[PDB]
Amino acid sequence: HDNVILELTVRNHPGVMTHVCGLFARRAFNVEGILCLPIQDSDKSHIWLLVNDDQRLEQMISQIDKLEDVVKVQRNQSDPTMFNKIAVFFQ
Amino acid sequence: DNVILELTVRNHPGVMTHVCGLFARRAFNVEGILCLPIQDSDKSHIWLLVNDDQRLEQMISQIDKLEDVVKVQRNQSDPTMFNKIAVFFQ
Ligand SMILES: CC(C)[C@H](N)C(=O)O
Numbered sequence: 001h002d003n004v005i006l007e008l009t010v011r012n013h014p015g016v017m018t019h020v021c022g023l024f025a026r027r028a029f030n031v032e033g034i035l036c037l038p039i040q041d042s043d044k045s046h047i048w049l050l051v052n053d054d055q056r057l058e059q060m061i062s063q064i065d066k067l068e069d070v071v072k073v074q075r076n077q078s079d080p081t082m083f084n085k086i087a088v089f090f091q
Numbered sequence: 092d093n094v095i096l097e098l099t100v101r102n103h104p105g106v107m108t109h110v111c112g113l114f115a116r117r118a119f120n121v122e123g124i125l126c127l128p129i130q131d132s133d134k135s136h137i138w139l140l141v142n143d144d145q146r147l148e149q150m151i152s153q154i155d156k157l158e159d160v161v162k163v164q165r166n167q168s169d170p171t172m173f174n175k176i177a178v179f180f181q
């Protein structure tokens with residue numbers, strides 16, 4: 001499984017997830033898993049995307065950070081099996 | 092006060108943009124998301140944690156009408172699933 005996990009720190013405002021996924025949509029780029037949780041006592045959230053490793057990711061990652069509501073992006077700084085662990089309880 | 096809206100959708104690019112776009116076009120914030128692929132299928136499950144809202148009534152028929160949304164279920168998952176997940180994440 002050549003997947004990578006992008007962990008985004010975003011503003012918790014309407015529209016943010018549509019802007020982020022929209023960038024994958026415009027590249028015909030499937031997102032495999034998503035988690036989004038608010039960060040307590042803040043106006044921000046984390047979004048985790050699970051996507052396949054692709055030669056276009058580095059430029060897409062740069063495009064994600066340029067979004068006004070994305071304050072930060074990390075790649076493969078999350079538990080690599082988090083979606084396998086979550087799935088076990090919720091399927 | 093929150094509710095989970097549960098979608099079965101086609102696991103294809105742009106599908107999550109179409110779903111979240113419905114909320115964005117109403118300035119309706121989404122508090123929690125989980126999306127997981129359904130194994131041995133072309134579908135994924137999406138759980139959306141949102142404020143139970145008079146607006147969420149009008150939205151629900153809009154979501155169901157999306158070509159790529161296979162099924163909509165509402166209030167069938169305890170909203171604490173997101174608190175349970177959260178105890179394990181930074
Ligand atoms: C963080 C994200 C899910 C944002 N709350 C939105 O509704 O687009």
Ligand SMILES: CC(C)[C@H](N)C(=O)O
Pocket residue numbers: 021024029030031032034100101102103104105106107108126135
């Ligand atoms: C199901 C959803 C996350 C879809 N795979 C998409 O990339 O929009």
